[PDB]
Amino acid sequence: QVIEFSKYNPSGNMTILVHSKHDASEYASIANQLMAATHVCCEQVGFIENDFHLVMSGNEFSGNATMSYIHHLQESHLLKDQQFKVKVSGCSDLVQCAIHDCQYYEVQMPQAHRVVPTTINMGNHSWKALEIIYETYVHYVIPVKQVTTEIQHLVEAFVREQQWSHKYKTVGMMLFDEQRQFLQPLIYIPEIQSLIWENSCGSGTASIGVFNNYQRNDACKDFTVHQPGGSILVTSKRCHQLGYQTSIKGQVTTVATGKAYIE
Amino acid sequence: QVIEFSKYNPSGNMTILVHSKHDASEYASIANQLMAATHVCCEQVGFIENDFHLVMSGNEFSGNATMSYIHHLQESHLLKDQQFKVKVSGCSDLVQCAIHDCQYYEVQMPQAHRVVPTTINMGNHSWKALEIIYETYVHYVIPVKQVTTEIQHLVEAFVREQQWSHKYKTVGMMLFDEQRQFLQPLIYIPEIQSLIWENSCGSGTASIGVFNNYQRNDACKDFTVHQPGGSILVTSKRCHQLGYQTSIKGQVTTVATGKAYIE
Numbered sequence: 001q002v003i004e005f006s007k008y009n010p011s012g013n014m015t016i017l018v019h020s021k022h023d024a025s026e027y028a029s030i031a032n033q034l035m036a037a038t039h040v041c042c043e044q045v046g047f048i049e050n051d052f053h054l055v056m057s058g059n060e061f062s063g064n065a066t067m068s069y070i071h072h073l074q075e076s077h078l079l080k081d082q083q084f085k086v087k088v089s090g091c092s093d094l095v096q097c098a099i100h101d102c103q104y105y106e107v108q109m110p111q112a113h114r115v116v117p118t119t120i121n122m123g124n125h126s127w128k129a130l131e132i133i134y135e136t137y138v139h140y141v142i143p144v145k146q147v148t149t150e151i152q153h154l155v156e157a158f159v160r161e162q163q164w165s166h167k168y169k170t171v172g173m174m175l176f177d178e179q180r181q182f183l184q185p186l187i188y189i190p191e192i193q194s195l196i197w198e199n200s201c202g203s204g205t206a207s208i209g210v211f212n213n214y215q216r217n218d219a220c221k222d223f224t225v226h227q228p229g230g231s232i233l234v235t236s237k238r239c240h241q242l243g244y245q246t247s248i249k250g251q252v253t254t255v256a257t258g259k260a261y262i263e
Numbered sequence: 264q265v266i267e268f269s270k271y272n273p274s275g276n277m278t279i280l281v282h283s284k285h286d287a288s289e290y291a292s293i294a295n296q297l298m299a300a301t302h303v304c305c306e307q308v309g310f311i312e313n314d315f316h317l318v319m320s321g322n323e324f325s326g327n328a329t330m331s332y333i334h335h336l337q338e339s340h341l342l343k344d345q346q347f348k349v350k351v352s353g354c355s356d357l358v359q360c361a362i363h364d365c366q367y368y369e370v371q372m373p374q375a376h377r378v379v380p381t382t383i384n385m386g387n388h389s390w391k392a393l394e395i396i397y398e399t400y401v402h403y404v405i406p407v408k409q410v411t412t413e414i415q416h417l418v419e420a421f422v423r424e425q426q427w428s429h430k431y432k433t434v435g436m437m438l439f440d441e442q443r444q445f446l447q448p449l450i451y452i453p454e455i456q457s458l459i460w461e462n463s464c465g466s467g468t469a470s471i472g473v474f475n476n477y478q479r480n481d482a483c484k485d486f487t488v489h490q491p492g493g494s495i496l497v498t499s500k501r502c503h504q505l506g507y508q509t510s511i512k513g514q515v516t517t518v519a520t521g522k523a524y525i526e
Contacts, residue, residue, distance in 0.1 A: 005519075012301050038275050038462070038492065040519045041304050199301070229301065256268075256303045258521015 003030060003260040007042060008068040009253040012199025012229015014042040015068045016260075017054075022047065024055065031057030033262040040260050043198075048072070052086040052097075060136075060169070061090030063107045063202025063248050064232075070097050070105035071252035090136070096247070106235070106249040109206035110134050113243075115214050122154040130214055132207045138165075139172035139207040147175050147184040156195055159188040166190075174204045176211070182226045183208060199229030206246045209236025213244060222249065266293060266523040270305060271331040272516040275462025275492015277305040278331045279523075280317075285310065287318065294320030296525040303523050306461075311335070315349040315360075323399075323432070324353030326370045326465025326511050327495075333360050333368035334515035353399070359510070369498070369512040372469035373397050376506075378477050385417040393477055395470045401428075402435035402470040410438050410447040419458055422451040429453075437467045439474070445489045446471060462492030469509045472499025476507060485512065 004020035016034050024047075031045035045057040046065045054069045056062055066088050073079045081101055085094035096108035116131040120140065129140045144151060155173045164171050168190070175184040185201035188194070198204070205225045212220045212234075219237035236246040267283035279297050287310075294308035308320040309328045317332045319325055329351050336342045344364055348357035359371035379394040383403065392403045407414060418436045427434050431453070438447040448464035451457070461467070468488045475483045475497075482500035499509040 007303065009301050014301065014304075038272050038277065038518075040270065041277075254524055255301075256519075256521055256523045258519055260519045261517055 001030075001261070001263040003034065003262060004258075005034065005040065005260050006072060006257040007040060007255045008071065009255050010064040010068050010071075010200065010202075011227055011232055011250060013044070013064040013202070014199075015062070015065045016040060016042040016045045017065070017068060017072055018045065018047045021049075027055065027057045030262060034260055039262075050084075052084070054086060054088045056089045059089045061088055061095075061110060063109055063206065064200065066095060066097065066107045067105045067202070067248070067250055068252050070099060070107070071103070071254065074099050074103065074105070075254065100249065103251055104233075104249050105252060106247050107202070109203065109246045109248055111243060112207070112210045112246065115210060117214075120158060122158045130211050132210050134203075136168070137170040137172065137203065138168045139174050139204060141174045141176055141207055141211040143178050144175050145177070147177060147182065151175065152184070152186070152197065155186055159186065159195065160193070164188075164190045172201065172204050172207065174201070174207055176208060180226065181224050185227065197228070200227040200232060202232060202248050205232040205234050205248045206236070209234035209246045209248075210244045212236060213238050264293075264524070264526040266297065266525060267521075268297065268303065268523050269335060269520040270303060270518045271334065272518050273327040273331050273334075273463065273465075274490055274495055274513060276307070276327040276465070277462075278325070278328045279303060279305040279308045280328070280331060280335055281308065281310045284312075290318065290320045293525060297523055302525075313347075315347070317349060317351045319352045322352045324351055324358075324373060326372055326469065327463065329358060329360065329370045330368045330465070330511070330513055331515050333362060333370070334366070334517065337362050337366065337368070338517065363512065366514055367496075367512050368515060369510050370465070372466065372509045372511055374506060375470070375473045375509065378473060380477075383421060385421045393474050395473050397466075399431070400433040400435065400466065401431045402437050402467060404437045404439055404470055404474040406441050407438050408440070410440060410445065414438065415447070415449070415460065418449055422449065422458065423456070427451075427453045435464065435467050435470065437464070437470055439471060443489065444487050448490065460491070463490040463495060465495060465511050468495040468497050468511045469499070472497035472509045472511075473507045475499060476501050
């Protein structure tokens, strides 16, 4: 079976988009084969179906994969700088997207329902954190003076020991060096006990925007969040009853395009 | 810069072959970019230059990359089952290659100059091993009752503590479960202190052939060496003054072909 694909580098969160048409029932099997390290290899797969529609293999929403799709539209379909909406899996409403100058792509992110200032106990210390609750995941923004291997091991231990609400399909521990504007994102998937120190995290970058809004009572615009795989910008503002309104913006590199062979 | 490439799965030792023409001075820069995990990603890159010529990015010889090239010749250039020779980097003479029935590809491997039965001390135990000395590397075939994480950690410790002759560009620790015909290969590159538990190892599979010959005084033909990423067959015989004559044979899957973008 031949799969027409492109492989993208959105700040190291390697993404494949599929251009060829496949039955949606096959998406998980195709994506599982492409993602393998013994295959083309990537961290997530989207299927491209004015009719913009992106379906992630697991029906989840990905800001980094949506950004990759916007990049594809600009470089391949020669879309001009504009604001438009895209239908993406995991979102009830169309997602606000934009092509900006200098090949920056902006993606509206899921709404933070509420935040809770908390402390988490790891080893012999208490860490102030902001719990940010979304419809299908939770992030903890944990300010640190510096990211260290010791703290990473404490965070791994902490996530494996807690019992996580089944509401949260992913749990994010977002270690944030405020001075260096550096995010070291950990994503935990409780269902499969998967723990990953991500190269970059679009949803985590959006959480830094919410954190900034909560901490400062001011909007942030194109706030740079450095991560292991590059940087992503976050724009976030609390808009009265509409709550936090957050987008991320970044660049994407196409690393390859061609045919992948599966089955 | 556009690079026409194919990505191959030779028992998990992911290999890219480049089809487009490039200056040999550029091979290391192109290969370093393609191999990155933020790029197409692979473990080694060969450049395709009756004139069969394969140049590895680091001018080394790879049995698994040569096998991948033979696969390319069979599936793309529709070469029939035949014995032929290929010029490969790292070899003074042309390399004997074959396309066999059922898409098995055979590659003549570098000659083991000599073997030394030895013991190595790791922790509180002595392990019988066969030291197999080649022109530019050394392998230790270490029979084990079973491969364990504890033994893997002992082997890592052992290779980092020894002082290795500069003759040996790579050092291989070949943990071999004889009963299960299972090889757990570790490759150490002293110069860059790189330590890798390989998915598969063509040179290590050839060393198992030499080991079998030394241990039993008989030839082995299509002896199956199971490895983490699949299996490779080894054919090996000691031929009087010509010494050990060894080849490996295996299957290769093409996972993708297309254009990669670098610079």
